[PDB]
Structure 1
Amino acid sequence: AARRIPHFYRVRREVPRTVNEMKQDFVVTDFYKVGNITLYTELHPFFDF
C-alpha cells in the first residue's frame, strides 16, 4: 500500500459519498424533516445501519 498510494490516484474517478458522511451535513433542526434521506439508516443509538 505504501507504494500503491500514489498509484491509487492514478485514476481520476471519485468514490461515491459514504452514508455516515451523509448524516452529518444536516443542521440540528432539519434532521427530523423528510428532506433527510438517511432516516431509514438511523435505527438505534448504539449502531450504524
Structure 2
Amino acid sequence: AARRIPHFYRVRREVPRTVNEMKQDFVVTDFYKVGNITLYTELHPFFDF
C-alpha cells in the first residue's frame, strides 16, 4: 500500500462520506429537527453506530 497509494487515486470515482462525517455538518440547534438524517444512529453516548 505504501506504493499503491498513487494507484488508488488513478481511478476517478468519488468516495461517499460515512455517517460520522454526515453528523458534523449540522449546527447545534438543527440537530434536533426532522431535516437531520442520522437520528436513527445516535443511540448511545459511548458508542458510534
- Provide TM-score, normalisation by structure 1: 0.96
- Provide TM-score, normalisation by structure 2: 0.96
Q: Deviations over 1:1-48 (max 9, x none)?
A: 011000000100011111000000000001000110000010000001
Where do 5+ consecutive residues of structure 1 fail to align?
none
Which stretches of structure 1, 4 residues or longer, exceed 2 Å deviation after superposition?
A: none
Where do 5+ consecutive residues of structure 2 fail to align?
none
Query: What is the number of residues matched between the two proteins?
Result: 49
What RMSD in Å do the two structures reach over aligned CA positions?
Answer: 0.5
